[model samples]
Target: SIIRPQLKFREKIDNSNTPFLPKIFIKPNAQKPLPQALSKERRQDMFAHPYQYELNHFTPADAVLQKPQPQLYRPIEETPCHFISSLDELVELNEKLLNCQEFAVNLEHHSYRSFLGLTCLMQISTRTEDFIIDTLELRSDMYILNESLTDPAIVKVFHGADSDIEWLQKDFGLYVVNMFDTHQAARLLNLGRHSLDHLLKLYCNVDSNKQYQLADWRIRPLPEEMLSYARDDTHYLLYIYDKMRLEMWERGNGQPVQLQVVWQRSRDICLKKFIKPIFTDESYLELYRKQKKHLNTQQLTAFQLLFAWRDKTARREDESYGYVLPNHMMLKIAEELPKEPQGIIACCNPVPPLVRQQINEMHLLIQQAREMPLLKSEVAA
Candidate 1:
C-alpha cells in the first residue's frame, strides 16, 4: 500500500519535447489544499481530521481471555518494508493496520532526552511487511491508527509492551485492547533470557543490532542503520510469538496457565496509565508531604510547587524531569531560598539558561505557597 513515486533521471525531462513534469513536492505545512482531482477515498482520509478514533468499546459481557494456543503464529505472505511521511501514505497505512487481524508492534522512546519520556517512532509488522510510523512527523494523524489498537477483534502483539503502553499513552493517547505481550508469555513459560534479543536469537537465529538503543531519536532523516534496527524490533515478533506459543503448547503439563497476572499487570501499568493519571498535581503535592521531613514546613510548601512545576514543565517541553531541574537543587532552593538571581544561578548551575531563569523567578511563587494555610486534611492526617 505504500505509494512511492519513483522518478529515475533518464533524460526523460531534459528535452523541450518532454510530455510531462513532476508534481512539485508539497510543503509539509502548506495551508493550501492539495490538487482536487486526486482526492479519492484515501486522499479524503487526510481530511478525516475530526475522526474520534479513541473510545473504549469494551462491553462487560465481552471479557477478553488470554487463552493458550497450540500455535498462534500466522505467516505473512509478504515482506514489504514501508515508511510513511505524508498524508496519503499514512492514510493507506492506517487502513492496512485496521484490516489486520493481528500484528506485531514496538515503540522507541527517549526517556533520558525527554521529560515524561516521548515515543519517537512506532514499528508495526504484519506477517509479511514492516511499517515504521515516523511519529515525529505523523503525530497529529496518530489517532487514526488508534482505532485498530483499541479494537478488540484485532490482536495487537508486542514483545515488551509495559513501557510501550505508558509511552504510547503519553505520546498519542492510545490504549490497546486484545494485546498479546510476548514478554509476559516468556515470563509465564519461565524461558531463559527473556529479552527480545535473546528470543530472536534462540528462535529465529536472528541477531539484532543493538548499538542504537540509546541513540538520540530526535534526529531528522534517520540513518539507514537506525531504521533497520527499529524495524528489527517488531519485524520478527510475530514469528517469535508463533514459535514460543507452539513450544509452550508442546511442553504443556495438564492445566491451563491463567493469564490473569498478565492482564492485571498490563491493565494497571499500561491501560491505567493511558486514561487516568496516578498522580495529579494536588495529589502528588500532598504525597510529597509524607516524605519523612525531607524539608521543613516552608521548604515542604516550596517543594510542592516545585515538584508540580517540574513535572508539568517536563511534560510540556518533552524533556526529562531532572533535565528541567534536578530535585536535589530544588531541595536546596526550598530549604534555603537563595536571595539573589546570581545566588540562584550558582545554586542551579550546570543547567540550561532558561531553566536558570525559571528557577530564579520561582522565589515569589515559593513565598506565596509557604504562606498559604494548610488544608484541613493536611492538619488532620
Candidate 2:
C-alpha cells in the first residue's frame, strides 16, 4: 500500500485557544543580573507563606485502577474492517497473526478531561489498518486483558511501550508478554530522539502531525479526522519495525537480549504501584511542588486535605479522583479555605453533591487541626 502524509494542519495554523496549549508566549530577552526580588529573603518569605497548598494523606491503591476510559484493545466487531469484540474474536485474530512471526501494536487512551467528559473511543492500529473501537458499545468482559488475547505467543511491536503497558495494566489487567518496544530499539540503535513521530520522520521519512493529540477520545462514532489520525499512527509501524530489525541484525547487536532487558524493566515498573504519600509528608509535598511552587503552610494543609478527600472518594467510588474534582479546583480550595460549610460549597468549582458532603467533612478535619501541636515544637523541643 502507498503511504500518504498524515499532516493534520496546513502551514502551522495557530490554535492557541485549544485547551492543551499554554497561554503565555515567552520571547527571548537579554540576560541581566539577578534582581533583588529573587534574593534569599524573598525566597524564604515565599516558602514561609505559600500561595497554594496540597495534602498527600491519600495512598493510591495498587489494586484500584485509576485509568482513563476508552481503553484500546483488539476489537472483535465484524465490520468491513478488523474489529475484535469478543474473546473468541481475539482468539481467532491471534491464531491468524501467530504465523506472521511479528506484527505492530499501538493503543489509544481517553485523556484525563475526556475520560471525565464520558467519551469512550479507543484507538488501536496495526501496520496497514487503524481501528477506532467504540468502548461504550463493547461488553465489560471484552477488555484486552482477557487471558485469551494477552496469552498469545506473538512478537508485539510498539513505540513508547512503557506508557501503553502502564495504561493497559491499570485499565484492563493486561501485560505484554512477548514485546518489542520500538522507542527502546531506536535508542539502543542510537536513532535520534526516540519519539514515535521523530523515529518515523528520521528513519522512515513519514511525517505524522499530532494536532488533535489531546482531543477527547471518548466521543462515539468518531469523526473522520480523528479516525484518520488514529489510523496513521499504526499504519506504517510494521515497515519501521522491519527496517529497524534489519539494521540491528546488520550491526551484529543481540536484538533479543536488548529487547528482553527493556521489556523486563517496563514490566517491573508496571507491576509496582505508586502510592502517593500524605500531604504533610515532606517527600510527598516535594512531588506536589513539581506542579506548583512555594505554597504557604495553610495552602499546604489545604492541599493535604484535598488529596486525602480525592483519594478516599476515588477509591470508594472505584473511579478516578480527578474525575470527581479536578486538581485546579482542589488547588483553588487549598489556596482559600471556606470557613463555613456554605462558604466551602461555594468555593469549589463544579462541586457535585457528593463532593459537597465531603467538603463539609473536610471543614471539620481542618478545624480539628487547630488543636494539633506546631511542627517545630513536635519535631524539636
Candidate 3:
C-alpha cells in the first residue's frame, strides 16, 4: 500500500510564527551548520585536498559484498516508467525499491546556476518499473531512499557512477552499498567505447541520442523529450549490466576472475566522498595560470581582484562563476583596466547581466587594483 502524506502542525519557538512560516516549516535537523571541526579553515583544507580526506576517511570493511549476477537481461520496452514528484510518491517508490534485489540508478545534476550544484533529477529503474524522482522538490526527504540504497543485499547498477556517487552523497545523503558500475566493467572488458550510448548500440541494437544531455534539468514539468531521455539512461542500464557481466566471465574463460576485478573497481569508485569547492586567497591565480596570458603587476592585480569579486557575487547571488562573469570577459576587463563604467561595459560584448548592474563595483575594483604597488618579486622580474 502507498503511504499518504502526513501533515502535522508543530508549534514554533516564537508565538507569531505559524506552520506556513519559512522557519517554522524547516525540519529540525535540515540545513544543519557544520560542526566546529569541519567549519572554517578545515573546510578550506577539505576543498584543497579532497583526495586526502577520502583516504583518511576510507574504511576497507565498508566495501560492498558482491552478489551473484542477474541471469537474464531485462527488456526495457516492457517496463512502466513512474514520475515521482511528491513525498507520497517517493515513499511508495522507496517501498518498491526496497523489495527489489537490484535496480539501476542515474542522476542529472546542475552546476551553472547554483553556488553548490544540485541534483536536479534522479532516475531509478527496477526490473519492471522506471522511476524518475524530482530531486529538487523532494531534496530533504531523499534520505528515505537510504533504506534500499544502503542495503547490502540489493545491488544498484550504474554507468559512469563517479560523479553520480558524489552527487548522491552531496544532495541525498545517500550511499550505495552493493553496487555495479558498467563503465568499469566495459573498461575491464576492453570495450573500445565505454559510454552508455556505445553500450546501448553494441548490446541492445538501440541508437541513443544525447542532444539533451546539457538541457536544464531544473525546468519545471520537463518536456516529454527530456523526460524520455532521462528515462533512457537508467532504463537500459541494468540490462547492460547483465550483458557486461556475461562478457567479463566469457573473456576470463574461467581463469582470470575479470568479473570480480570489475566489482572491486566499482567499489573503489563508490568509496569516494564528496567535497565542497571553496575559494581561497590564491584561487584566482589558478585561473591566471590557466589563461596563460602575460600581464603586468597592475593588470594581474586587477585580474585577481575581479576574479575574487566574481566569486563573491556568485556566492551571494547563488549563481555560477561563469554565469556571473565568464572568464574571457573578466580577462578582457582586466587587460583593458577600464576606469569608467562605460569603458567597463565596452570591454564585454553583450555584457553579462551582473556586470551591467554592478558597473560601479567593477570600476572600483579596477581603480583599487591600479593604486596597489607591485609585489617585491614583480620589481625583481
Candidate 4:
C-alpha cells in the first residue's frame, strides 16, 4: 500500500504562554551603547555578515515579517470560462454529458513530488461546452466519476491520456471508461512529429504558445494566462478530432487501420492497472548501485537508511515527502554518514530541519547495519 504523509500543520499548537525573551546578553564590562546613527550602521554591517552574529540571537519581528505581495492575474484573449465549484453544477454537467457521443479531455497537475504529485485540473470539453473542475477543491467528491464513467456512449478524446488516467485513479479513485488519445492517433496515422502543437498546426492551421506548460497549479485563483493555456489544450481538440475522423473515414475507404490502432491503444490504456509500491531499502540500494557504478558499500547502505528515514519522517509530517528532505541532500547525507556530530554539522549545506533532527537516528542505523554478521560461504545444491 502507498504510504501517504500525515499533515502536521493541521494540528493545533499553543504558543500563547511561551516566553519571548531575547537571548542576546551584553557583557558586564561592555562599553556604553553607541549613538543611534552608529548603532544603525553597525546593525546593517552585522546583517550583511550574519555569520559573525551569535546563532542564538533572534531577529526582531519586523525583520522576520514582511507584507505578502498581492497575486497578479495576467490578461488573455480567450473566451472566459468558470470552473464548476459546486456538486450541483457537476451533477448538471454530468447529466448533459451522459449521452454526448464524443468529448475532449485534458488533465493539469503539479509533479514535483509523490503523494501530492497528481492531477489537480480535470478539463473536459464537448462540441460546444467545456468544463474545468478544480480537483484540489473537491478531494472527497467521487460522484463526478460515478456520473461520468458509467456513460460508455461518450467517446473521450484526449492527448497522451495514459498518465492522466493513472493520476485520476490514484488521486480521485476514477477509471477511464472510453478514450481516443490524439497522440496515439497521430502516431498511428503517420502524422509527422505527433505532438499536440504539431497536430494543431498541421490539421487546424492554428499555433499556440505553450509558454506556461510548467506553471504551478497549486496556487489559488490560477493566473488567467495559465487558465487560457490549459483551455486551449482541450478547446481545439474536439475540432481536430472531427476533422481527423472524416479524414480517416475517407482514406481507409470507410475502414481506417490507423483509427483502429489508436482505439486499440486507448482500450489498453483504459484497462491499465495501478503499479505496486516499491519499499524495500536493500533492493532499492542494489538498483541504485547497478545504475551508478561509483557508489561504495558504505554509501549504498547509508543511502538506503536515509531513504527509509525520509519516508518515515515525511509520512509522520503529513507533508509532501520532498518538503521533509529532498533526494539530492539525502544522497549527500548518505555519502557522508558515520561522521562525528561536528563533522556532520560542518558538512551540512542544504540539509532540511527534519533531516537534521534525525541525524543521530540515521547515524545509528548506518553504524548498526555496518556491524551485522555475514555468512562466509554458501553452495548451491
Specify the highest-lDDT model's number: 3
Summing lDDT over every window of 10 consecutive residues in candidate 3, give the lowest-scoring window: 20-29
User: Model 1: per-residue lDDT, tens digit, 23-118?
Assistant: 211212123443453233323322222112222223211223422342333333346779886668878887887887578889877666554455
Model 4, TM vs. native: 0.69
lDDT of each: 0.60, 0.49, 0.70, 0.58
RMSD of 1: 13.0
lDDT, model 2, position 346: 68
Over 4 Å off in model 4, which ranges? 1-80, 279-284, 287-298, 318-323, 345-349, 366-381
List model 4 lDDT by residue over 1-381, tens digit each: 222221212322112223221111221111233233324243232111111122122121221122212221112233456587566777777777786766778888875443436566878776666678877666446435544553344667888887886666556546555567777767656773568987877766668887777766766677777777777788778766656655665667656555656666776776554442435566556666777745555666667776777666654553455666666666666666555654454455766666578767766876764554433331111
- Candidate 2, residue 88: lDDT: 67
Cα miss at 100, model 3 (Å)? Answer: 0.8
Return whichever of 1 and 3 wins on TM-score: 3
Worst 10 residues of 2 by lDDT: 48-57
Q: What is candidate 3's lDDT per residue for 1-381, written digit by digit as tens?
A: 211111111211111112211111111122232233443343222222222233233332322223335554456567777889788999899888878868999999987776667688999988778889988778777867877776656778998899998878666656666668888888886773668888888877878988888877787778888888998888878777767766666667644376666666777787776665765536556667677766778988888889888878886766787888987888888888887789988878778888989989889999988787887887787
How should the candidates be ordered by lDDT, best one leading? Answer: 3, 1, 4, 2
Error of 3 at 371 (Å): 2.4
Off by over 4 Å in 2: 1-80, 86-91, 111-153, 253-303, 326-335, 345-363, 366-381
The best candidate by TM-score is: 3
Which has the better TM-score: candidate 2, or candidate 4?
A: 4
For each candidate in turn, the TM-score is 0.64, 0.58, 0.78, 0.69
